[PDB]
Amino acid sequence: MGDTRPRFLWQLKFECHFFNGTERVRLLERCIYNQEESVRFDSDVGEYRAVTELGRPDAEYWNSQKDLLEQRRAAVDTYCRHNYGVGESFTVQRRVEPKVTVYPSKTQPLQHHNLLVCSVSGFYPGSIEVRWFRNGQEEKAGVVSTGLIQNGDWTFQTLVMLETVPRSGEVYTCQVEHPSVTSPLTVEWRA
Amino acid sequence: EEHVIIQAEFYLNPDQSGEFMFDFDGDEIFHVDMAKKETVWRLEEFGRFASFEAQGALANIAVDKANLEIMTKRSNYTPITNVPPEVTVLTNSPVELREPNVLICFIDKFTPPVVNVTWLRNGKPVTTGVSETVFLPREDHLFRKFHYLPFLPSTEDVYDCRVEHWGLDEPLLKHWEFDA
Amino acid sequence: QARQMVQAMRTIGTHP
């Protein structure tokens, strides 16, 4: 696309930060011009502060409006705590159990070595532990994770690979701990 | 920190593009469709348990546009620097021949929030069953987006995501196929 | 049913 006209971008972010549910709440109101935060309201501070010279005129103009500062000060309750109770049942309390699969990688990059994949698909929330075991001893060498992948649809995936040297007499176990299940998920692979 | 809820809005000139959405720990709760003037919940079930008055979002966007015009002049007409996207293609789950799956095109770390995304099957554009998200915020004030293509895995078919952005010298292709 | 309402912060005009 040959549209070379200059672009100008204005963003506003109202961030509600929660610690131990609604026990501690911090509101951060942020104004961003192009890619540079210019001015912000932090409920901990209680007024607008310029973060760049561009934002000075706005911090001065807004800080001199006593009722705006009052409404912003109360927002931690009328906005953050209010919205947390409305959303709590389908966000904070959301739980979705992973599908766990073990298979040899369709790609084998290392000789005398069987690369095994533990796939963990479709879980929520993000906190998860994936561990490899061989005849019930934990394996930590030769483990490589994609880490946490957000699918964009309120689910996560992760792939945890094990570089193995195949022997007779072995069972490999991928063990998954996740808040959605009361005991760990296990999937075995045998040669 | 247990959790973060963000109300993120933007206005972009000269495209005349406005967006209004809520984020919970990096996932979209909902956005307002500026054309239909209606709340669109990310998962339909969310709309069973909450509601939002969309006209509130349209009034905020009018103010945001008015403010962009002030800030544009106040900056001595300083335009945004283009940051081009990082692009990744992967499936929703491990591929099994003739078992339905979804290709994800993840477009990350870019600005401004304008991109043209196409799916290709065996070199030709495909639109059947495709879907996308709006522009999702990042803490560095860049954007993220996802595009999705449902498909039946085969050994015959190959796919690409095609991404166009002003920060790129050329349009990008990210390829996916299932071999052997 | 009794609607659970999300509340929006209102954006305000900058220094003119």
Numbering used by the authors:
A (entry chain BBB): 0 to 190
B (entry chain AAA): 3 to 182
C (entry chain CCC): 3 to 18
Copy out sentences from the published article reporting this entry, exactly as the authors wrote them:
CD4+ T cell responses to IAV, mediated through recognition of short peptides presented by HLA class II molecules on the surface of antigen-presenting cells, are essential to multiple anti-viral processes that confer protection from severe symptomatic disease during IAV infection (Wilkinson et al., 2012). We focused on the HLA class II molecule HLA-DR1 due to its high prevalence in the human population and the pre-existing molecular studies using this HLA type (Cole et al., 2012). Unbiased epitope mapping of the entire M1, NP, and PB-1 proteins revealed five IAV epitopes that elicited robust and reproducible responses across multiple HLA-DR1+ subjects. As part of our structural investigations, we solved pHLA crystal structures of three conserved IAV epitopes used for clonotypic analysis (HLA-DR1-SGP, HLA-DR1-QAR, and HLA-DR1-GMF; HLA-DR1-PKY from the F11 complex included for comparison).
Fine mapping of the T cell responses using shorter 13/14-mer synthetic peptides based on in silico binding prediction (Andreatta et al., 2015) was used to isolate five HLA-DR1-restricted epitopes for further analysis in four HLA-DR1+ donors: M117-30-SGP, M1129-142-GLI, M1208-222-QAR, NP302-314-DPF, and PB-1410-422-GMF. The more immunogenic epitopes in vitro and in vivo, namely, M1129-142-GLI, M1208-222-QAR, and NP302-314-DPF, were less conserved, particularly in swine sequences. Although M1208-222-QAR and NP302-314-DPF both had minimal numbers of identical sequences in human and swine, they were highly conserved in avian strains, at 86.7% and 98.1% sequence identity, respectively. M1208-222-QAR specific repertoires were also directed to a single TRAV gene (TRAV38-2/DVB8, mean = 50%, n = 4; mainly coupled with TRAJ44, TRAJ45, and TRAJ49) and to a much lesser extent a single TRBV gene (TRBV20-1, 23%, n = 4). We generated peptide omit maps, observed density maps, and conducted atomic-B-factor analysis of core and flanking amino acids to confirm that observed core 9-mers matched those predicted by NetMHCIIPan 3.1. Subsequently, inspection of the starkly contrasting electrostatic surfaces of these epitopes led us to look for sequence enrichments in the cognate CDR3 sequences that reflected simple biochemical complementarities (for example, opposite charge or shared hydrophobicity). At the simplest level, they included measurable enrichments in total CDR3 charge or CDR3 hydrophobicity, which were clearly complementary to the surface electrostatics of pHLA crystal structures (highly acidic surface of HLA-DR1-SGP and highly basic surface of HLA-DR1-PKY), as well as the hydrophobic central surface of HLA-DR1-QAR. For M1208-222-QAR, the LxGxYN motif was partly hypervariable in origin (LxGx) and partly germline-encoded in the enriched TRBJ1-6 gene (YN).
